[PDB]
């Protein structure tokens, strides 16, 4: 079984600059008979199936822009994306189709390197309807920020909450190249009603110092 190994795993490139992804196959995929490499490159955007970019190591599929070019032979291969565009954020896979089993590389995530952008922060109290069920979810949203690194700290009456929140992050936006993040603090209705001040504190490179959004339980 041919092992496809991509390099690097993750790549951050400025818009308009060049992205290069290396792929090494453990056996040559160059077929002597026709002198062609049985190597393909795929692009996969979030929520979508892989899309074929390049076959024969170097031949571009119909409808695929000139900025995508494949090169190499035998075991070593390279995908080059010149003039990186915002819409090019994706995971890229090399694949050998030389012999069964067809094998794929582990994938390379291409991220866009843009200017720093501070998150817009919003806190949401639990609804009355949820509270009646016995649980309180408190939500903090960090909207449209760059880079991805961010720190969210939950405080309930000055006590830092640890172990009782979960975070989810969007895939980098295809237009503005930012991320958004939601953190959800979950507690029992009984715990919720024992405390007053609920606060989300956000630390990010784009903020001159941390931003806190807060509410007092029951207060307008």
């Amino acid at each position: 079984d041919i092992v496809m190994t991509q390099s690097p795993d993750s790549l951050a490139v400025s818009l308009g600059e060049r992205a290069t992804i290396n792929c090494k196959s453990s056996q040559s995929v160059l077929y002597s008979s026709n002198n062609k490499n049985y190597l393909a490159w795929y692009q996969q955007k979030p929520g979508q199936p892989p899309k074929l970019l390049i076959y024969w190591a170097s031949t571009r599929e119909s409808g695929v822009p000139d900025r995508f070019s494949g090169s190499g032979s035998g075991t070593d291969f390279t995908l080059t994306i010149s003039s990186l565009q915002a819409e090019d954020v994706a995971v890229y896979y090399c694949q050998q189709y030389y012999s069964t089993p067809l094998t794929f590389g582990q994938g390379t995530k291409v991220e866009i390197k843009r200017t720093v952008a501070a998150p817009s922060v919003f806190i949401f109290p639990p609804s009355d309807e949820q509270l009646k069920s016995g649980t309180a979810s408190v939500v903090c949203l960090l909207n449209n920020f760059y880079p991805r690194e961010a720190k969210v700290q939950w405080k309930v009456d000055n006590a830092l909450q640890s172990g009782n929140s979960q975070e989810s992050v969007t895939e980098q936006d295809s237009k503005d190249s930012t991320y958004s993040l939601s953190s959800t603090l979950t507690l029992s209705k009984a715990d919720y009603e024992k405390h007053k001040v609920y606060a989300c504190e956000v630390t990010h490179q784009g903020l001159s110092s941390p931003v806190t959004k807060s509410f007092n339980r029951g207060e307008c």
């Binding site: 199936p49 076959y55 089993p101 794929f104």
Partner: protein, 216 residues
């Protein structure tokens, strides 16, 4: 146009069986070899099985050999994957994929169908408001459901700009939860109605939730 539409995926017990289908159209199905390729959540692509254009030849990955059976019906234009003795590790989106006529690469893929191998129960979500207090944010919290997926739209698809629907996270209860948010002009809060349309097809749960500033 060329089309591959997978169906038959869903929640199944470990040790259980499931049959996937793929309806091919827009091309001469029998002319081309076909493949099944899977992708576990957050992971890479794994080739599963291939079948010749006639059906005379079949190939399988080692991980699926003896458990899965690829087959096709050229009169119906349909590819099948019979999956037996399922394991938690077989949980994946399963893609139907067409080979190129001569060269032999996978040049077209369907949208995929999700297979979840688990003993956990189907459960529909509860939907709660994330109420707003230049730009305001509001949203819906879609909490405590199983299995994936859920869909969320805003205003029946009329509102798409500034919407962020977050990846679902698995809670320690073994149930998923997700939020969908949108940013809107704060001046819109008095006039414009904002409703999130939530559908969890696996549990037959459809909810429309109107979200507005909370009254004092």
């Amino acid at each position: 146009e060329v089309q591959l539409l997978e169906s038959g995926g869903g929640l199944v017990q470990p040790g259980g069986s499931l049959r996937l289908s793929c309806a091919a159209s827009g091309f001469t199905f029998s002319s081309y070899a076909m493949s099944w390729v899977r992708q576990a959540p957050g992971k890479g692509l794994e080739w599963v099985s291939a079948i010749s254009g006639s059906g005379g030849s079949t190939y399988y990955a080692d991980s699926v050999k003896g458990r899965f059976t690829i087959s096709r019906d050229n009169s119906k234009n349909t590819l099948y994957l019979q999956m037996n003795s399922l394991r938690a590790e077989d949980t994946a989106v399963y893609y139907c994929a067409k080979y190129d006529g001569i060269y032999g690469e996978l040049d077209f893929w369907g949208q995929g169908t999700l297979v979840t191998v688990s003993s956990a129960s189907t459960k529909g979500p509860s939907v709660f408001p994330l109420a707003p207090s230049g730009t305001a944010a509001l949203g819906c919290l879609v909490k405590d459901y199983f299995p994936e997926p859920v869909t969320v739209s805003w205003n029946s698809g009329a509102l798409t700009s500034g919407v962020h629907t977050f990846p679902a996270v698995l809670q320690s209860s073994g149930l998923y939860s997700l939020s969908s948010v949108v940013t809107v002009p704060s001046s819109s809060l008095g006039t414009q109605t904002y409703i999130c349309n939530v559908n969890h097809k696996p549990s037959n749960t459809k909810v429309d939730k109107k979200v507005e500033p909370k009254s004092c």
